[PDB]
Amino acid sequence: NSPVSVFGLGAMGTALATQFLRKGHKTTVWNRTPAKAQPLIAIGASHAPTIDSAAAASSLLIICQLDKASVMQTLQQAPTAWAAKTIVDLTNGTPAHARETADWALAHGARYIHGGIMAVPFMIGQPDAMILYSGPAEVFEGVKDTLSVLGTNTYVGEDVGLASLHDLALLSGMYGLFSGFTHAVALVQSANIPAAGFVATQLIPWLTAMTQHLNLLATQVDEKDYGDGGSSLDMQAKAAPNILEASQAQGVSVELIQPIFKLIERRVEEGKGSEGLAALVGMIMK
Amino acid sequence: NSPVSVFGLGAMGTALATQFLRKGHKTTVWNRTPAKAQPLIAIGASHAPTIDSAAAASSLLIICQLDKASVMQTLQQAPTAWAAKTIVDLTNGTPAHARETADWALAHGARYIHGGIMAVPFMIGQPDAMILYSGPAEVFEGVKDTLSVLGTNTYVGEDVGLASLHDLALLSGMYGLFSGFTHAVALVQSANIPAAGFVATQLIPWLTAMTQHLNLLATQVDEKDYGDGGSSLDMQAKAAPNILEASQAQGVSVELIQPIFKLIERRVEEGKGSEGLAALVGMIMK
Ligand SMILES: NC(=O)C1=CN([C@@H]2O[C@H](COP(=O)(O)OP(=O)(O)OC[C@H]3O[C@@H](n4cnc5c(N)ncnc54)[C@H](OP(=O)(O)O)[C@@H]3O)[C@@H](O)[C@H]2O)C=CC1
Ligand SMILES: NC(=O)C1=CN([C@@H]2O[C@H](COP(=O)(O)OP(=O)(O)OC[C@H]3O[C@@H](n4cnc5c(N)ncnc54)[C@H](OP(=O)(O)O)[C@@H]3O)[C@@H](O)[C@H]2O)C=CC1
Ligand SMILES: O=C(c1ccccc1)C(F)F
Ligand SMILES: O=C(c1ccccc1)C(F)F
């Protein structure tokens, strides 16, 4: 159980450090605001008094702060502390941010991989958690068994920005799901329908079926052949006004769902109403 | 196996009529454009020469056309044909549309229930299909065993507009899901990543986990207590710019995902960044 250091003790960094502790690792912790270390000290963490101390304590240095600007602030406070260490940066950012941080790390003698945590904090250490990783394969292979205590490791390749592209794509997908949740639950709550009961009984099973449907849509995207699948855009463009008008009648804003209806309408206006929803991917691409 | 008539032989009405035929019902079919009956004639349907003939053939009359205006056009072509028949109207519409059509039906001597088909055509007759129904319970009970061949029957109550509210809420949820799919797949395709492979391997498992998460969100909505759940809006408002900027870098429009980020930003600006996503429901409500 190799020593690990965690920089960033917010909700997620706390979950990561806690899981290292459960798995028997000497877990050194650092946070910009030191009071946040107290809960972790109480369950066995070693609270580093400085950035340099936290870096010195371990060879595997996990950074889970806020954004890339925050990561660079921490790295630059102790520029010589990182040499011959492996930085695993789990802080949300763009592909470009990962490449920028990697360039800095390599120039300061450190090894670097970037990862994207596909979990909320309570999922860490649980079977459904997964973390995407990218950067030099030999670097990842040196730390993958320690990192595996957090979740399933999904190494996507050598390009250090690639895990971030996968991450942000998955988050995009989730934000659409949550847009749908918000709209659906506002509509039922407008009629005093139990939200949890509706969501467990009706919404989740429907979304499960329509999630499986995404396989067919994705095949159509790859084929660039946008079959209706039995559900043409012409037909959907005549249902969309009903969803909008019913929402207006219930006092529910349509802001979260209007964009896809405008895209569907545009495809109908282009003369392609006989196609299905897989057509919409290319419509938002360059 | 009681005789059934189907009005509307588009993708969905064809699927409904086909399933009645497989289950041994004398299945009478009608379509505004008569050529569309030919595939169903070939597998045993009785093609009605008129609206009145189709109504006369059965006591259970299913209407699956386009919108409420279309339903009223069919009903009004033969106003005396509906007396002492049960109309099951599966044509998409608002709660108000169902109430309007029901008022007409009752004034012309017919029984009426409205339903919302939670299925695409290939799902009809399969275990995952479900149809929502509302209107007089005694009317529904008279036809529920015949209707059960199509999917699971979910009778929601006596108010004839209620199935349509549930339907449009579920469709709203699905359109958010599909917004997420579209954005996520455009981002990976911008980097030449296989769409089907990404969706099957990464997107679907992530959406499955985040769909289960909707139970927690829904409980928080019912409680009007918008705990962060480990994922505060303040934190999400610092990730959202990364998703937007990465999308811009890949040439992908952000139109489908920008609205939820604007709502998150607004909640942070209101001083409620410490809350979680369940807060967004009330934000779009009256
Ligand atoms: N929570 C979640 O569900 C998920 C989070 N993520 C990502 O994980 C990361 C952490 O999220 P989470 O823990 O929830 O966020 P929190 O808001 O709970 O914590 C943010 C952390 O970043 C630190 N930080 C902010 N600015 C700086 C700075 N300039 N220098 C040093 N440290 C700084 C904070 O320190 P201080 O205490 O001093 O403010 C704190 O440790 C983010 O990048 C997030 O996008 C990934 C997946 C899920
Ligand atoms: N397909 C799907 O995935 C789903 C569809 N639905 C709903 O089911 C219904 C049917 O959808 P679907 O079959 O896919 O749509 P289609 O576009 O395939 O068929 C539309 C049907 O409506 C008929 N119609 C349109 N205008 C009129 C009119 N004025 N008078 C009489 N008939 C008319 C068409 O007749 P004609 O051939 O003469 O044009 C045709 O039979 C819609 O309300 C839809 O929202 C529900 C869930 C899923
Ligand atoms: O638009 C509708 C739909 C589209 C795809 C799948 C399921 C339903 C609904 F109005 F028919
Ligand atoms: O914003 C993020 C997130 C929010 C909820 C669930 C999972 C992830 C990510 F940037 F952290």
Author numbering:
A (entry chain A), B (entry chain A): 3 to 288
Give the exact sentences the study uses for this entry.
The third form, which belongs to space group P3121 and was refined to 1.52 Å resolution, has one molecule (one half-dimer) in the asymmetric unit. This structure was again complexed with NADP+ and also with the substrate 2,2-difluoroacetophenone. In the complex of AdRedAm with 15, the phenyl ring of the substrate is stacked against the side chain of Met176; the carbonyl group of the ketone is coordinated to the phenolic hydroxyl of the side chain of Tyr177 at a distance of 3.0 Å. The F atoms are again positioned 3.2 and 3.3 Å from the O2D atom of the ribose sugar, suggesting again that these inter­actions may be significant in permitting the reduction of the ketone by the cofactor to some extent, but only in the case where F atoms are present. In addition, the ketone 15 presents its re face to the cofactor, which would result in the experimentally observed (S)-alcohol product. The complex illustrates the imperfect binding of the fluorinated ketone 15 for either amine or alcohol production, and also provides a basis for understanding the stereoselectivity of AdRedAm for transformations of substrates in this series.
The NADPH-dependent imine reductase from Ajellomyces dermatitidis (AdRedAm) catalyzes the reductive amination of certain ketones with amine donors supplied in an equimolar ratio. The two AdRedAm monomers associate to form a dimer in which reciprocal domain sharing results in the formation of a large active-site cleft between the N-terminal domain of one monomer and the C-terminal domain of its partner. One of them, AdRedAm from Ajellomyces dermatitidis, has been reported to be more stable than AspRedAm and thus perhaps more suitable for process applications.
